[PDB]
Amino acid sequence: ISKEELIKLAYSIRPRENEYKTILTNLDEYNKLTTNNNENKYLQLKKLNESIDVFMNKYKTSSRNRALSNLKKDILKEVILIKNSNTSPVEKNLHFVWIGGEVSDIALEYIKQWADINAEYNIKLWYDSEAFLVNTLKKAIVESSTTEALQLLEEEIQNPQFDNMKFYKKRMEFIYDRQKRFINYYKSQINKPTVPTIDDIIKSHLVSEYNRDETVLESYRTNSLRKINSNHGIDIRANSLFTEQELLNIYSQELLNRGNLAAASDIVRLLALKNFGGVYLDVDMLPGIHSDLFKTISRPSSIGLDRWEMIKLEAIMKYKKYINNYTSENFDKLDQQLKDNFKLIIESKSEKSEIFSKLENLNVSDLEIKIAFALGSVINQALISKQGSYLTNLVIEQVKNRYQFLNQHLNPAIESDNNFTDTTKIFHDSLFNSATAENSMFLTKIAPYLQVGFMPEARSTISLSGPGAYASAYYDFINLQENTIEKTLKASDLIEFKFPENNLSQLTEQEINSLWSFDQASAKYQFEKYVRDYTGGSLSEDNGVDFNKNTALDKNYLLNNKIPSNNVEEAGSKNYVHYIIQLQGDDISYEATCNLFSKNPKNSIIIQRNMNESAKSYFLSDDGESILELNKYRIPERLKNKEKVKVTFIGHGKDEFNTSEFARLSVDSLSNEISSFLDTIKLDISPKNVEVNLLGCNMFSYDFNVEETYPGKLLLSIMDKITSTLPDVNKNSITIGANQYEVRINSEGRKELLAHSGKWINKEEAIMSDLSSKEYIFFDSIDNKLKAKSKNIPGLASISEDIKTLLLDASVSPDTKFILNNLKLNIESSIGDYIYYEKLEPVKNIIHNSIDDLIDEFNLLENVSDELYELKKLNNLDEKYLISFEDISKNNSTYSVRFINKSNGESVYVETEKEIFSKYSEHITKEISTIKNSIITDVNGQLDHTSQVNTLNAAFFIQSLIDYSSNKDVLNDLSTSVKVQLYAQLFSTGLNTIYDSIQLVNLISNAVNDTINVLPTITEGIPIVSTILDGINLGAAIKELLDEHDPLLKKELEAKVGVLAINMSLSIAATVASIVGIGAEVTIFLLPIAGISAGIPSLVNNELILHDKATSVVNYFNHLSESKKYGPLKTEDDKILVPIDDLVISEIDFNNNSIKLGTCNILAMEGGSGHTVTGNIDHFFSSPSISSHIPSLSIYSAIGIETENLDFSKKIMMLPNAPSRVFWWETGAVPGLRSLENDGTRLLDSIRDLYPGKFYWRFYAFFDYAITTLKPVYEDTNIKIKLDKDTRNFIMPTITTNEIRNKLSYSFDGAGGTYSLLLSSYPISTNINLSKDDLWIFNIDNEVREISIENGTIKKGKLIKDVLSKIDINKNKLIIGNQTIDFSGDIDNKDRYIFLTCELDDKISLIIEINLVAKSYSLLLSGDKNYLISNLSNTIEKINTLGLDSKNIAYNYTDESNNKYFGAISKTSQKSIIHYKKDSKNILEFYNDSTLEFNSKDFIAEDINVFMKDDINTITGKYYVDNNTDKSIDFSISLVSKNQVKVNGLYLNESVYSSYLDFVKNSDGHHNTSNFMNLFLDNISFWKLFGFENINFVIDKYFTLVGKTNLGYVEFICDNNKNIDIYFGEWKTSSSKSTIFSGNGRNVVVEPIYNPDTGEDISTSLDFSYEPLYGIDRYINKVLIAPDLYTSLININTNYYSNEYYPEIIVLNPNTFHKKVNINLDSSSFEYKWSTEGSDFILVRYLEESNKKILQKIRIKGILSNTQSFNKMSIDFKDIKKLSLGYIMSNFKSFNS
C-alpha cells in the first residue's frame, strides 16, 4: 500500500530506469483507485507484482531490488487482505456426486444426515442419467479380462514364486484391447444423425460381445434413475454444467474411455461450484460434532488422536443408530467407565438436532475456495466456493492444462491402433522427449495413466483431477502467478483456506476404508482370491512348510558359510546392537536368522525364542573364529556401549489384508512379549533410540492410516512401556519397520530372495519392490500422531540405479522390464515428493559442531530482520522508530516491544506474539556484554580493547551489523538498532535504563554519526601485543606511539601511558648540546653581589643611608666616575660584560649597539651670599640645599656619558642592578680634606661647574663644611632589553637589600636567537617577549641549591629538597621557587619548548623540557656515558631530592669530535638503554644500575625505536633477512639478560610470510614442541642482526605473529600453553572477503564484500579457492560460504592441489529475488558423487593426483526443504553446464553417509 513512500525508499545512482517507471505507474494505479469489489483489486497488484519481476530480472544488480523485494513481501500481504475482506455468507447448496450406476443404500443414509440437520440447505445430488451402466461395464471388462489372464497363465500361477504383477500386466493388456472395442463400437454409433444415449450404446455392446440381456440391464437403469431422482437427484446433462466443450471432452474421456468414475466425479465437482453455490462433500462424510458434547471427557494415552475422533462417532451410532450396521468395533473394548459416560451425555440431549453442528452461514470471499485438509496436505473430500469463484476457476484452469498436456502426448500414441504394451511405450517416449526441469515429476506421475484403476501403485488421478491440481491452483493465487505445475506449499499459507474444523468430521467408517490405496500389498491378497476362485486350492503363504522342527545353530555352518560367503555390507554407522529373534520353528525363519546375522556378525546376536526354555543368545565372541553362547537373552561387553538398539522379530504372518496376527501373536500379545524381553536387556545397555523390525510374509508398511493397522497399533503399546524401561530414549525416537522378505547377494552379484520354497531365488521385481516399500514409523515430535520417517534418499536412488542397469541389458523379460520401469518411476516420484511435501528436517548432529553455530547466526539475523520489518509495517512505524531489544517485556499472553522515537526521544510500545524478538534480545545483549566485558580495566578510560580468546566471535557479528549501518544509509533499521544499543552500553547505562527524551535523541544521534570498531583489523608493521600493565596495554600504546606523528600529541600520549620513547633526531641532539654548554660556562665563574663597589645601603629609621662620611661619598663619586670613563660596561676575563655597579641602565639595545640611562639625580641648593673661589676651594656664606622643593640635578649629565657604538661582542652579560633614584643629602662640619684630589672630587666639581649656584659639596663659611651623608630614594624602574638574532647569555645580579631589588624589573625582546638567563638567589621581577619562541634557557643553579655569601661572592651548596616538587606552568607565566617569570608577546607556538638547566654534578647536567602551552615538562640528562652509569644511582637520587615526579628520564649527549649518544632511563628500578652509532654501525647497550646486562657491538636494523616503562623495555624496528630488501621483518623485542632476548611479536611481508608458510608446511616433526617458533628464527637466522651468535630467544605467552598474503593478513597467537594457532585472519578477493577468527572454531566465513556507497551497482558473485588456505590448511576446520540477496553466481576453484587437507565447503541457502543461483565448478562432471543428509544436498569430489588422495566435499544447506529452494540451484562443471539438482540425482552415482 506504499504510495509515495516506495520512491526515494529505493534509490540508485543511475537515472530512473524505464521499467522502474512502469512499476511506479502500476504501484500508483493500484492506490489511485481502490473501488470495490475484490477481483479487480487482485488483478491489479498482479500487474504490479509482474512489473517488479520484469525489472528485478532485467537489472539484477540494481540497488532498487532490496526494496522492491520488500514490496513483493507486502504485495503478498495484500492478496490476503483482499481475500479476507468481503465476508459474505456462501450460497445454500450441498453438492454430492454418484455417477456410473446405482447409489448404494449406505451413501443415501450418510446424505440423509445433512438434510435433516441442515434443513436450510437443499442437497442437489448429481448424476449422469445417460450413463448408468458405465460401472456395470467396467466390471464386465475387468471380470472377463481377469479370467482371460488367468487362463493365459494357468500353468504359471501354480508356482509360488509367481509375481502377481505379471498377472496384472497381462490382464491390463486384455483390459485395454477390450476397452478399444467399446470405444470403437461407440465411435460407430455417434456420427449417425440419430443420437443414442451413452448407456443405451453400452446396453447394446454388453448383450452382443458379452453374456448380457437388455431386459435386465434396462431394469438396472430404471431403478437407478428413479432411486437417484427421488433422493434429491439432479441431472448433469439436463443442466448447462458442461457449457465449455473442452471440459465435456475431459469428463467423457474419464467416463467412457477409461473406467474412472472417480476421476469423472472430480470434473463434476468443480463445475457444480462454478455454476452454483459451494458446499461439496463425499458420500463418506458426516456433519461436525459439537465441541461441547465430549468436552468434559479426557483422552487416554493409549489411543491415537485420529482414533479418538472415530470412537466419538461410533459411540453415537451404537444406540442412536442412524446407520443400519455402523461399526463401533474399536470402541467396544475394555473401558466400561467411559463407555457408560458417553451414553448419558448423548441421551441427555434433544434427538438429532443438537447432536451435530450446523454450517449456518459460511462467509467466504468472491475469490477464495476452501478445501478440507488431511495430514498437512489438501484433499478434495469437502469444498466451499462462491459461484464462479476466482480460485475455483484456477483449479479448472489447472485441470484443463493437465489434460491438455496429457492428451497432447497420449492421443497420438492411442490413435495408432497398437496393443497396450506398445501404446504405452509410445506414450512414455513421447512424454520424456518434451521433458523439462519443471514438469519432470509431473511426467512420471502421469506415465501410468492408462493403468490407473487396473494396476496397483498407479495413481495419476491425483496429478490431473486430484489434490495436485488444487494445491497448484492455490500457489497460483498466493504468489500471483499462473499455471504452476509442482511448486511447494507452506502450511502457514494453507491455514487461511482450511475448512473450518468444527464442521468437517472427516474421519468416518467409510472414509477410513476409502483411503486404502490399491497397492501391491492389497494386490497380494486380491490376486490370491482370483486364484482361489479359479481353482479349488488352499493357502500356501504359511501352509506347507510351517513346522515345529526347532533346529539349533550349527556353529560350523554359521561360521564357515553364512559369515564368510556374505556379500552384503551396510554403509550406515555400526554403533548399534542387533537383536535377531526367531519366533517360529520352521526352516524358513531359521535360514533367515542365519543370513541376517551374516551381514553384520560382529554387531548382531541370535535368539531362537521359538524354544521357550532353551532360549540362549548366540553371538560372535570378542574375537572371531568361534561362536560363544550366553543365556538370559543378554549381550557381550563390547556391545554394551552402543547408542542404538536394533531388534528384528523373524516369523511368518497371517494371510490377511492388514494382518492382526504376526507369528500367532496378536497386537497386545507381542507387546507383552516385547515387555517380557526388554527388561532383560536394560542391564546391559541404555540406548538413545530403538528400531523395531518385523520380517515375514504379509508384513507391509502402508501409506495411509498406519494407526488402526499392525504394526501402527504396536508402536503405541511399546512406546510408553519402553521409554520408562530404557532412559535417555527420546519419547519419540522409536522406529518400527515391517518387511516381508530377506535379501542376499550371490557369488555373481545378483540379489536373491528367501521364499517359503526354502531356496534363494532371483526375483528382481519382488526384491526391488520390497526394499523400497519398507518404511519406519515413529511418534510425532509435537505428540500429534504417528508419522513415517523419510526413506533413505541415496538408498532409493541406489535401487533405481540398479533398475536402470537391469533395463539396460537385453537378457531380461519384457514383462519384468515393464514392471521395473513402473517401479523406477514410482521410486523417482517418491524422492521428488520429499522435496515437494517438505518432509526433510534439518541436520541435528550428535554434537554441537562449531560450524553449526555460525549457520544458526546468519539464519537468526535474516529472521529478525524480516520479522521486524513485518512488525513495524503492521503497527505503522516510520524510519524514526528505533527498536529497543533491551526492552522486550513479556505480558501475560504477548510480548511488548519498545520503539524509541529518534526525533522527540519518546517511546511507544507494541505487542506481538512472535518470540523472535525476545530470543534475539537475549542473544544480542549477551554478545554486547561479551564486548564491554572485554574492554578492561575499570579504573582507566574511550578505547582500550584488551581482546582475548572467544570474545572475537561476538565482536564479528556485531561489527558486521554496525558496518551495515554505514553513515548516511537508510536500511537496515535493525543494523542501527544494535549499533545504538551497543553504543549506549559502552558509554552509558543500559538503553533500557534511559527515559530522558532529550538524552535519548542526543545519544542516538552521536551513536549513528560516530564509528565504533569492536573488531581488530590487522595492519602492517608491529602487531598489537595484549600485555596489560598498570591498567594499560603497553603493546597497544606503543603501536599508537609509532603511528602518531604530531610530536606534541606523541608527547601527550607519553604523559598519559607513562611510557618514554627515545628520540634519535640529530636536531634535538644539537639543541641539547648548545643548551648544556651555556649553563656550564656561566655557572662556574663566581661574581660579586650588588653592590660591593658602590656600597650596600644600611636602613636607619625608615630611610636609606648609602654613606656616612664625606670621604665615603667622594669615594662613591670616584667609583661612579671611574665607571663611565671605562664605559657603561666592563669586560672581565674576556668572557662577560658587567655594567658599572649602581649605574642606572634603563635600556639595553643589542641590535643597534646602544644604551639608555635612567634618572640618577641629586638635590640642588639655592641662594648663596658671597661667592669666591681660591685654589679649587669655594668660599661662601651658607647656601642651603633645598629639603626639598626645588628641581633636581643630573649626576650622570656631568659624567662623560658614552652610549652608542659599544662592543657587544661578548655573549655573556651581567644584568644592571640599579634603579632610578634621587639623592637626598645634607652637609656637616668637616675639617681639613682641603684640595683633596680624586676622580670623584673632579666629578663633584664637574657638577659644581656645570651647575653654577646649584651645587656645592665642599665650602668655607666661617667653618669648613662638606657633604656629610648621602641618602637615596629609589623609584622603581624597568630595564627593557632589545635582542638580536645572535646568541646572548645573561646573569641576574644578586641584590642583597630588598628596597633596591623590589624596584627592579626586566623586559626582554626576542629576535629568533639563543637566549639564556642565569637566575639569581634573590628574585627579581622578569618578563619575556617570545618572538618565534626561540631558544630560552634558564639556569636555576642558584635557586635550587643552598646559597650563602662569602667575602661578597656566591657559593653554591647542597641541593634543597622539594624545591621542584611544586612547579607552576602557564602559557603566560612560569613559577619556579623562588623566581616568577612572566611571559608577554606570547605567540601561542605549540611547537617550541622552554628549557631549565642545573648542574647536578661537575659533568652531569639536568635539563627540563617545558612547553608553556602544554602545561607540562620532561626530564633529560647529559654527560659521559660511563660516568653517568656509575653515578646513576646517586644522580637519580638527586632528581628525587629536588622533587621531580617524572617516571622516566631521557638521556641525550653530544661528545667531542661530534659523536652522539641517545637513550632513556627509568627513575624506578634504574633500568636504562643506550643507543649510538660508532663507525657507521649501530650500537645499543642495556644497563641495570652500574651493571651492563646486555651488549650489541653491531645491531643490523632500521627504524629503530626504544621504549621504557618500569621493568619492561621494548625495541622495535625493521630487519632484512639475509640482507635482502624484499625480505622485510618488523620486530618487537624486550631485553632481559646478557644472553637471552625476549620476542614480543613479529610482522612478515609477502616474501617472508611465504617462507614461513613453506616452513610450516614442513614444520611437523611430527611433534617437537615448544621449540617451533624458536626454530623459525633459526631458519631466518634472526641472531644475525645482533652481534654475537650464541643467543636463545624466548617466545612469550602473548606472542603475536602476523603475515601478509597478497589477499590479506593472518594473525597467529600463542595459546595458553605454548601452542601456535590462528587468532584472526582476513583476506579479500575481487568479489568477496574471507574471515577466520578465534572462537567460532577453526572456520572460514566467506561473505560478499559490502560497498558503503549503496547507489552504485552491487556485485553478484562469490569467489572461493583452496589457494589462500596454503600452509594454514592445518589450522582450518570447514569453510562457510554465506551469500545474500544479490548473489546468483558462486565460483569455486577446486584445482589447487598443493594442500594436504581440504575443508568441507558449506553453502548456505538464503532468500533471494533472483530466479536462479549457480555454483560454477572448474572441475569435470565426473569425479563427483552425490548424497543426502537431511534437508541439505551433498556433492563430493574424489580425485587421485600426485599419488595423493583428494576429497572435496560441498554441502548446500536445506535445499531439499522445499521446491522453491530446490529449483534456485544450478551447477556448472568444466564439461557440462547448467544442471538441475534433480538431473544430478538422476545421472550421478549416489553414496550413503
Ligand SMILES: [Zn+2]
Ligand atoms: Zn509365511
